[PDB]
RNA sequence: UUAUAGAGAAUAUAUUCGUUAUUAAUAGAAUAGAAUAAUGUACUUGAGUAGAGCUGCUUGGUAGUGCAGUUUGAAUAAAGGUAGAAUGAAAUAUCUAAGGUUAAAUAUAAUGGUAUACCGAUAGAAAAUAAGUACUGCGAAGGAACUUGUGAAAAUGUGUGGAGUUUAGCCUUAUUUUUAAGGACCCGUCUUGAAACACGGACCAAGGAGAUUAUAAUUAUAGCAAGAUAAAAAUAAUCUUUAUUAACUUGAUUAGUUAUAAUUAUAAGACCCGAAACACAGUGAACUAUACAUGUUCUGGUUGAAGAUAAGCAAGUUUAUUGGAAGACCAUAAUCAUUCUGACGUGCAAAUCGAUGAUUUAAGAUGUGUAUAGUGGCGAAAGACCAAUCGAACUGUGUGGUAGCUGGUUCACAGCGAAAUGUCUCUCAGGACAGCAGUUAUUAUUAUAUAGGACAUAGAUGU
RNA sequence: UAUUUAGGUAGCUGUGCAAUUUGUUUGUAUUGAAGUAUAUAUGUGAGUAUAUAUAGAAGAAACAAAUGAGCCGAUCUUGGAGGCAGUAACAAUAUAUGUAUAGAUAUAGACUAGGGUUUUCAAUUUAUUGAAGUGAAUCGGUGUUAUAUAAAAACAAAAAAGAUUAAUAAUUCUUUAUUAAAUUAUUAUAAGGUAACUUGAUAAUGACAGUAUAUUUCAAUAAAUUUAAGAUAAAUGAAUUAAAUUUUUAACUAUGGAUUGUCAUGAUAAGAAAUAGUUAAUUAUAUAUACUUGAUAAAAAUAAAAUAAUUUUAACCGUACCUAUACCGCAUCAGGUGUCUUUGUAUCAUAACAAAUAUUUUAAAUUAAAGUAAGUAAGGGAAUUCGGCAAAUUAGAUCUGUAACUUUGGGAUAAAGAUUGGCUCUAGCAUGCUAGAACUUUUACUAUGUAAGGAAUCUGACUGUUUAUUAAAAACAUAGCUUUUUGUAUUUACAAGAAGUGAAUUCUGCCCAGUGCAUUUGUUAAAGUUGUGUAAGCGAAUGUAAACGGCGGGAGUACUAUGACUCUCUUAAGGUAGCCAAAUGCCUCGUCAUUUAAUUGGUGACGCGCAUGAAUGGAGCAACGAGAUUCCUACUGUCCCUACUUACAAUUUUGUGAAACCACGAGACAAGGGAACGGGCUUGUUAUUUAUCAGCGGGGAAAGAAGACCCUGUUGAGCUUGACUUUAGUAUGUUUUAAUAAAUAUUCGAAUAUUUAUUUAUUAGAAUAUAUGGGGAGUUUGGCUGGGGCGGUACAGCUGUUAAAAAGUAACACAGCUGUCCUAAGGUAGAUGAAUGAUGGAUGGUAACCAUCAGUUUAUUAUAAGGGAAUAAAUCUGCUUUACUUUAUGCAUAUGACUGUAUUUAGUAGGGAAACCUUGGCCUAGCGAUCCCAAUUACAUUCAUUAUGUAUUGGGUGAUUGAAAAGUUACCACAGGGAUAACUGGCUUGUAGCAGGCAAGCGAUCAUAGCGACUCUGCUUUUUGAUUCUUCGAUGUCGUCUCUUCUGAUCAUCGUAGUGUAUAUGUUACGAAGUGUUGGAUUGUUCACCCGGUAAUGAGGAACGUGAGAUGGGUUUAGACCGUCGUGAGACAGGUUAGUUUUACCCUACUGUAAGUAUUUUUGAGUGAACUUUGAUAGUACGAGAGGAACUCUAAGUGAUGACCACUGGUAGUGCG
């Protein structure tokens, strides 16, 4: 046969890999206030980011809700805590929305970073100093505490209201985002390029669930699937 | 010009260059003599090695013959290694590993010489050289013709002579030979069977296919013979005859050996020409496909969603304007390819021409630059496209790849003359053994003998 | 001394001729060698010798030697030259005197890619030779970069006119300018305005989407004026052409205190209008606003300034010419190729015409046929056809008017009507647009351009895309819906990877037994330790079907009929909501209604559905479609049935001048035999213009291509998987791993294991074992066969028949059997009337047991069949293990293994008194090599244990004298085969068709007017079979259209004869092939069945007549859909839709044309008696009545055929409007 379309999809993107911004937050020993500057908008990421000034210094930021050019943050471990300032995990009460959570301390950010997606925390336990945090998967994670967060919903709001009525529409989404449109069902491919193809009738004539078990070039359909259907 | 010179060239129908035989100059090498320089003390022995366990390659090496990865890793001459089945033990032989150098006898191109039972311009190298040239391919690469005198055949022109219009050419017999009577389908080839409506062949010249080598055997000839011989080299072995047997136990005997020639068998490109394929090493995105950067992209009409203003009737509700949204509607230039199954169909053209059709601000069209390569790329998916080639592109090598299968195979006369049947076979388009044939040889009561016969006698059988 | 022998394919042996070179001997030649061309002699023949002509330098013979040693063929290799043939196919403007007067076709001009002297001139005839020609501080490159090699179109210091040359000119020359760098002369270091700001007085940017509307800057039109030009037989308030001169708004500041603008949306207490003022007005590629977006619209090098002057200061490379007859397609090719500019009329444009500019020289004609284009048609209007394929009708603009349905937006420009010129005026205001009125005519968008309309069904939601070159679609995509994996992402869950269905509305039923997937607590390798112990995986349990998939059958029960209800086999569950002879129903052209004169078609209903059915999605149509199908209206040469005109090729002339094909073709036919369809062979019948010209497609099984269909080959390739053998990747053990201290557990002070803490290590790996593993890699996938496949094994053994009186012998011929059974069913000694029948005997019977007599093989002998045995080879009783060990040989049987079975030398045993018998079954069947493994007996080496050898058995190949092995190809390839199928032909006639002989009976009695049972004998090649003789280096399949000819087994028409013939109307038989046999609906049809009509719609052949005559509907390559089968690639004589039809110019045949005049005769060939009907005969003959003819005589008509233009109709580059 030949080289499917999953593997050549991943070469392809070592040879021109997709590049955005990864916005990081420095990291300061006393509270400082910071003015907001201008807002602005990236190619592949739909919310839009901040340029905030901290010390004759611009960074870049992502902007939470309510946000004006010119207000005034302030930035620290004991900040007061109120909308777009940034804080340590420990001072804020239980119930809050917080978007960006660093692993570890002195670093950047790593978890909610998208627009109109946000965390909640459920309680603080003073016994080995660890909070546990709502994820927006779903799932409860432990934190350790005297990690630094910024405080407030992310922007944006919700895109998916609107469908692309048109195909037209989706044409731009995924041209902007580098992924592959439009995309062909595999039982419509000859029995060289994919597995499932051939044929007298479209159908599989194979079972879809496939173990993680196989190597790498043979997985393809529902991978390791606990569950299949509608529950009711 | 007799000759230490009769090797060979050149001129014309007796002369020269050379051969033969002698010297000189320069460079290099070796041997010997004479002279100049020079001579003290020296007790070293090879470690992350050798060897074991697991694992892979190599050799004739069989249970390592040799090498390497990983784990482990000794003794120092009162010591260590080896001795053609395995391990353990013992005697007898014989050697001392893990550091270094080394002439001669040996193998073969570019470059220059000397010879020959080799070819003589479709031969010999691709090239008697303005030849690796002219010319072709995007590229890796491919790659010819032509000497000087004589003037054959195929195919034509002019002149003279002759027959008839109902019959090409050939054989026999005839001085009615440019006619008469008899005979006579076109050759080669597979085939039970060919003039066949079975295949190849329009015509002339030149070229063109069982030769060479190794190992065996039979026949003819030559030298010596209980022995036979040009092995490498310089001025021994082998066969008669391994005497049998697995071995022990045992054992005389068919004139040979070395060469020359013809035939047969096996292996070498192997009588000549012919596949679809496989591996190794390389070249292409100028056509066409996709992503990224930068530029360019003619003109006229139709319809009427939000938003806004007024005038009526009385929380609102009718009428008239303004406004110009949409993967809305229609045409020219530009683009594509539904139908006539129109034209053309050794074409204008290796995909064109005419009428009729579809298409319009976009998921469009197009120039240039960078990225993607053949068990690989690109794909709104038809196995489509990747330089007129794609269900695995193109160029060179292994390569004169293998063919139980089609085709061809070159001079005369004389003697002799077949099978299409039995058994075994992954055997049924093929092989081997048996049968039928040919050639040569020795010998006579195996004529006191034989017979695809008859007669006399003794019998078998179940149509 | 052949009085005896002599043919011969495949094949074997002997004697001889030809060519090139080598050693020795003998000889020739310039008064002429070798070669070549004609004769003569000689040899049975391969061949040789001589003579004459030509040419000019070397060659011959004998005895021996070495081979690249003798051509008609290979679709053989290279060169030269024929026929067809001067044939096909292409090119062909006028002038009596000209560097001109006319005609004709084509839009034209600049930068880049490509070309490279083609440029210009001279001389000689789109050629040849020779000279000359390209001038840069400001026109390109050289510079910066596109997130470790990128721009002649992105960014960047600066110029224009006017003339010169045979050819260069933003480059030479004249005139007026600009930039940068080096040297000179001179100098402000700040003023002014309340403010916005003005003047020498620095620190700015390169730099960035698309669409709509409003400005009318320039420019251009239009007008006026001034100089000039060209024409008219005439006439015209003065025409036509050329050059120039002219035709307030936006920000900001100061007062002010509440209104005000645009074509549209508005602006203002974060200060409106009105005043006073300061800056600018970006030149159409501009300015200001508005609108669309899950798209917000590149980088880097790059900066200073006042006034005047100077310069042998500004380097290197290209600057000719062509834009298609100077590029690419082998070419002076109707194809292809980036950007820009271009005048006049043109009331929306388009189309068309004219300017401008560039090219161009001489055959004929009122006449062919058949072609490629363009026109017109009386009457009928789809009757033609698979199908209205092709053509025709409609159309612009203004005014009325507009339905069912609906996803409320649409449908809609629906459909259906009416009007349109020219000239003279009137009326509005926005001043070039719109309404109305009068007069007039061979009546008005129509030169060019410009929608036929309506009613239904199946399928896809829509805009979009696709097999460059036979398929544009119902296929692909799409939004919408759903499932799944990941919290250690250069990117961070409203994100990033993997799959299925296909807009909206309404729904999405049951099953976890099978296969997969997930989660959790019996079997299983190596390495290490004195020894011992511990892995994942497989198996088991629980979930999961918008995962792969599946969703039965039989019996009774309420005048007939049916079964709400009941009983019953099993299973994982037994197709629910819906839908239908649908693109899905074989029987099948299902049943009913309706559409038509007539329907296998269309639409609506019915359902025990061969084989419908729910995201492998079911149901459904509003909008959309060069998708598939049926019916109405209009329209027409598609047809009845064809006719006329023009142009270009063709026919006639000159010039340039080919190809396919060719065994021989010298005239053609009927029958015969033959390799079963001859141009040539055998018997018959026949043509001929002085050697032609133009047509035509019957034949040469015509030409192209070593058949793609089918079969064979111990020949291949693409693809799938529960085929065989393995491997990358990955999971899990063991061993290697920095030191230290401590804790805990397991084994016996010690050995193991687990876990925590510190820093003194921390490049992050290495060596082995087990499992998973079509993601990949190699290779295989028997034979026989009345073609292959499916079925059987006729592929190993045994018996009887075929089988023909010795031995031997075939068929997918006949009837059968075999891979077993037995410690006794083996060995031996002895005894013995078996099976059955008759007559009797308490319970006792057809049949229980006991006696008597008879009893030739009927009984038994393990088994298939055949053979053998009556003091028995059978049944009983006793005793035993010969179901042995060693030397030699034979028979099936052979040229030959393995096997079965008879016989021998010497031992050791059993039965018997002894003679004797015994090496498994009474005889003919139950039969297996080389290599390797296991066992038994002997021995062999310095020593123990082991290994290796010789001998005998067992383990086994059933394809049985013996490889280790699954499919598919419609995407396919190669070598071959008429040794072998699908089509024609040939022999045969079961089947098909057409007739005969005899006479039981029917017919009111009567076999034969007319029929005829049970049986029997034939012909024809017209159905369908059976066989495989000719073709696989090719003979073009079904049906239809057009056209000719032939047969009798006669449908009418003609002549006779029977009758169960009164007339009329029938029916049967004999002679007879002259002439007729005609129109439509449905289906691809042949066949079939209806409507209408007539004198009568007869049966058939000619390669199942006829494709270089036509058409292409089905069948039959590559796209695609449904149903059934298969896990899968795939398959279906089950149903659909779209799919390139080549070549005549040879020979022969056929139609015409081609022999000095003028009058005729004879012979040969063709052709030579079509059919219906009115009136009279006549209401007559004949008949109870009803009814009801004929001979003959007059009047017409249809079908065919030969001519003609007085009348009528069609046509018309002849003629007029
Ligand atoms: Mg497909
Ligand atoms: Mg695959
Ligand atoms: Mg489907
Ligand atoms: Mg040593
Ligand atoms: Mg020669
Ligand atoms: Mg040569
Ligand atoms: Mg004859
Ligand atoms: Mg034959
Ligand atoms: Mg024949
Ligand atoms: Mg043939
Ligand atoms: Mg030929
Ligand atoms: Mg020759
Ligand atoms: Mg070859
Ligand atoms: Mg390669
Ligand atoms: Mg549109
Ligand atoms: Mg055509
Ligand atoms: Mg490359
Ligand atoms: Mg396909
Ligand atoms: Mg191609
Ligand atoms: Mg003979
Ligand atoms: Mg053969
Ligand atoms: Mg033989
Ligand atoms: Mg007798
Ligand atoms: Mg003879
Ligand atoms: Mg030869
Ligand atoms: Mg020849
Ligand atoms: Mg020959
Ligand atoms: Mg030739
Ligand atoms: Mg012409
Ligand atoms: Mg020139
Ligand atoms: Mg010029
Ligand atoms: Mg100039
Ligand atoms: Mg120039
Ligand atoms: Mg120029
Ligand atoms: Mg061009
Ligand atoms: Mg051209
Ligand atoms: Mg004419
Ligand atoms: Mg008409
Ligand atoms: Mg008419
Ligand atoms: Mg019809
Ligand atoms: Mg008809
Ligand atoms: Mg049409
Ligand atoms: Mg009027
Ligand atoms: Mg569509
Ligand atoms: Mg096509
Ligand atoms: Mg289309
Ligand atoms: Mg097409
Ligand atoms: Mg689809
Ligand atoms: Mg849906
Ligand atoms: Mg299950
Ligand atoms: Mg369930
Ligand atoms: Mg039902
Ligand atoms: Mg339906
Ligand atoms: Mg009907
Ligand atoms: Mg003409
Ligand atoms: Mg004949
Ligand atoms: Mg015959
Ligand atoms: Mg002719
Ligand atoms: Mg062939
Ligand atoms: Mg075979
Ligand atoms: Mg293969
Ligand atoms: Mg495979
Ligand atoms: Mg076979
Ligand atoms: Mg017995
Ligand atoms: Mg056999
Ligand atoms: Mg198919
Ligand atoms: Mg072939
Ligand atoms: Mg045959
Ligand atoms: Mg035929
Ligand atoms: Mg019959
Ligand atoms: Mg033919
Ligand atoms: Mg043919
Ligand atoms: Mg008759
Ligand atoms: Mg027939
Ligand atoms: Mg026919
Ligand atoms: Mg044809
Ligand atoms: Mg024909
Ligand atoms: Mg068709
Ligand atoms: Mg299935
Ligand atoms: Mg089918
Ligand atoms: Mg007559």
């Given at each position: 046969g030949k080289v499917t379309r999953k593997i050549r999809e991943e070469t392809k993107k070592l040879r021109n890999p997709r590049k955005l911004?990864?916005?990081?937050?420095?990291?300061?020993?006393?509270?400082?206030?910071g003015t907001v500057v201008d807002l602005v908008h990236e190619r592949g990421r739909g919310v839009?980011?901040?340029?905030?000034?901290?010390?004759?210094?611009?960074?870049?930021?992502?902007?939470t809700e309510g946000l004006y050019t010119g207000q005034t943050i302030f930035i620290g471990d004991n900040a007061p805590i109120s909308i777009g300032n940034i804080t340590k995990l420990k001072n804020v009460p239980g119930g809050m929305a917080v978007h960006s959570?660093?692993?570890?301390?002195?670093?950047?950010?790593?978890?909610?970073?998208?627009?109109?997606?946000?965390?909640?925390?459920?309680?603080?336990?003073?016994?080995?100093?660890?909070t546990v945090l709502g994820l927006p998967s779903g799932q409860k994670?432990?934190?350790?505490?005297?990690?630094?967060?910024?405080?407030?919903?992310?922007?944006?709001?919700?895109?998916k209201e609107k469908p692309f009525l048109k195909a037209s529409?989706?044409?731009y989404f995924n041209k902007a985002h580098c992924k592959k449109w439009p995309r062909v069902r595999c039982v419509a491919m000859n029995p060289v390029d994919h597995k499932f193809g051939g044929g007298n009738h479209?159908?599989?004539?194979?079972?879809?669930?496939?173990?993680?078990?196989?190597?790498?070039?043979?997985?393809?359909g529902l991978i390791?699937?606990?569950?299949?259907?509608?529950?009711?």
């Open positions: 911004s990864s916005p990081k937050y420095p990291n300061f020993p006393e509270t400082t206030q839009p980011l901040a340029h905030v000034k901290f010390n004759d210094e611009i960074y870049s930021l992502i902007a959570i660093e692993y570890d301390y002195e670093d950047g950010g790593c978890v909610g970073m998208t627009g109109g997606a946000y965390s909640t925390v459920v309680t603080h336990r003073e016994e080995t100093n660890e994670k432990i934190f350790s505490s005297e990690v630094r967060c910024i405080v407030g919903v992310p922007s944006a709001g919700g895109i529409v989706a044409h479209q159908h599989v004539g194979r079972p879809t669930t496939i173990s993680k078990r196989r190597p790498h070039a043979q997985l393809m390791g699937a606990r569950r299949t259907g509608r529950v009711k």
